[PDB]
Amino acid sequence: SAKDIKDEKIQQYRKTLTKIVKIKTAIFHETVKVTCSKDGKMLEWYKGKNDSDGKKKPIGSFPLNKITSIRTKVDNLKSLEISVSSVHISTYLFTFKTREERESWQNNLESFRKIMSMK
Numbered sequence: 001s002a003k004d005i006k007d008e009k010i011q012q013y014r015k016t017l018t019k020i021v022k023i024k025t026a027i028f029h030e031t032v033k034v035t036c037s038k039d040g041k042m043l044e045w046y047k048g049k050n051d052s053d054g055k056k057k058p059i060g061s062f063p064l065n066k067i068t069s070i071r072t073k074v075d076n077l078k079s080l081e082i083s084v085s086s087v088h089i090s091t092y093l094f095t096f097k098t099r100e101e102r103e104s105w106q107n108n109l110e111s112f113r114k115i116m117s118m119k
Contacts, residue, residue, distance in 0.1 A: 007040070009040065009112055009115055010036060010037075010038070010039075010040030010112075013036055013108050013109070013111075013112045014035055014036040014038075014040075016104065016105075016108050017034065017035055017036045017043075017105065017108055017109060017112070018033060018034065018035040018036075019033065019034050019035075019096070019101070019102075019105055020032070020033050020048040021033075021034055021048070021094050021095055021096050021102070021105075022093075022095040022096075023045065023059065023092070023093065023094070023095075024090075024092075024093035024095060025089050025090050025092060025093075026088075026089055026090035027060070027088075027089055027090075028054060028059060030047060030049065030053070030054065030059055031047075031048050031049045032045045032046065032047055032048045032049075032059055033045060033046050033047070033048035034048075034094065034105075036064070036109075036112070037061070040116075041063055041064065041065060041116070042061050042062060042063040042064055043061055043062060043063075043064050043109075044058050044061040045058055045059060045061055046058055046059075047059060060089075062084055062086065062092065064109070064112070064113055064116060064117070065113075065116050065117055066084045066085040066086065067082060067083070067084045067085075067113055067117060068083045068084055068085055069082070069083040070082045070083075070106055070109065070110055070113065071106075072099075072102070072103070072106060073093070073095075076095075077099040077102075077103075078095060078096055078097065078098055078099050078101075078102060079093055079094070079095040079096070079102070080093065080094035080095065080096075080102050080105070080106055081093055082094060094106075
């Protein structure tokens with residue numbers, strides 16, 4: 001757009017949005033590198049373990065505009081429970097090894113979400 005608005009948010013946030021975290025779903029629990037899509041509409045994640053990936057591709061990213069609530073796991077501040085409008089799959093848990101690491105993530109992603117969902 002200019003230096004801030006449409007594309008720029010995607011490029012800017014994507015950098016800080018990329019993190020090695022532990023994903024926890026009904027389908028699979030896999031340590032993964034979470035980043036934002038090149039389109040900026042979804043949150044794309046690539047296996048962040050090593051070679052023990054059970055997809056050999058993105059494990060099945062979801063669109064950020066479907067998120068219904070993003071809050072830190074109230075019983076575990078190192079984890080993040082993200083409720084999203086989802087199909088066959090459980091609520092998405094973004095889990096880090098420390099709070100400070102995950103803290104930065106929601107701070108960024110929530111605002112990026114606010115640009116799209118709270119637009």
